[PDB]
Subunit: 99 residues, 4 copies
């Protein structure tokens, strides 16, 4: 079913790459998108494979970047017995616009 | 900054309209979007004003509906001393497709 | 660079299948996507976007979609021109949602 | 019905402002939006979408945007035709992000 998200925002931290038990890389950053008295929303992005590593190369805290992807929800149990409901954006592609 | 979300999914419950302290209506439903071994993500939608009331009229649990909007994050403290981080989709428009 | 298009419309004619010399299928319909917002005259307008799908999907749109089918489209917007130079724009679909069983 | 377009490109020429008889401004540029994905020949392609903005925004795009400016666009896709009947498609922008200070 149609599920589409396009974003331009700035990374809050540096991208965090980590290596999965299957052996494939998984990227993590947060995009801060000023809303178009100014507030910004903070979407969490997830990238995989080739795209994931590129973001570790070129993107860093404060980089302006564009994102095209699908919007996903997962749930897990955190370090204690609590159920975290997460919503995030898995990026089909990630465009480096300006630092 | 660019922030755009388009979705087609099915309502999980019936839409919940409620009336705000300012006097304006605020709509609430959850959209279940099968991903294009089938899983679905559950995005929470928010509508306001005219659009909000329409969804109470015409949409109900299981209605297939399309959504165009922006992606927003808010935080609050829940009934106990816990900080809920929420991400949701405020709908610029809501299209009734099929029940 | 970012380039994305989401659309819900009804097909004006029936879908047209063709094959490239390369061996890959190419589906064709044009969508009638009513505007959600009324215009200054208070009347309701429609745009007619031309969609293109490729490979396996093109066969599915040929199988299940027909004139008047309600359908969703996710894709990018592409511009080409060729000789009698005609300026064409249409929507190459990454995916196509059939919003009707028929 | 859903109809949405997001784009990031560079302007090919400088923005063109005009005014309607109604008194409302209408901005014009065309964007060059490089494809993110390479083609079968391994070369990089670009689409040239024509954008339209209205009212106050049109003046801002005229003020700050110029040929080669990197810019973001959020809007819908509209189809019109008129007499010498020319088939035009372009992107009426709900909003326009200036991705460069210049
Ligand atoms: O400012 C932030 N808010 C929320 C986050 F998840 C984050 O990384 N940074
Ligand atoms: O199945 C559901 N998951 C999450 C929700 F918030 C909801 O309302 N329904
Ligand atoms: O109703 C229509 N108007 C214009 C077209 F090109 C078409 O296919 N159908
Ligand atoms: O490089 C260009 N190609 C085609 C066009 F219409 C244009 O404006 N610029």
């Amino acid at each position: 079913m149609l599920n589409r998200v396009v974003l331009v925002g700035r990374l809050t931290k540096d991208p965090e790459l980590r290596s999965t038990p299957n052996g494939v890389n998984v990227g993590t950053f947060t995009l801060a998108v000023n809303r178009t008295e100014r507030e910004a929303d903070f979407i969490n992005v997830v990238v995989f494979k080739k795209q994931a590593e590129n973001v570790k190369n070129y993107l860093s805290k404060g980089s302006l970047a564009g994102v095209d992807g699908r919007l996903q929800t997962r749930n897990y149990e955190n370090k204690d017995g609590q159920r975290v409901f997460v919503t995030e954006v898995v990026a089909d592609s990630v465009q480096f616009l300006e630092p």
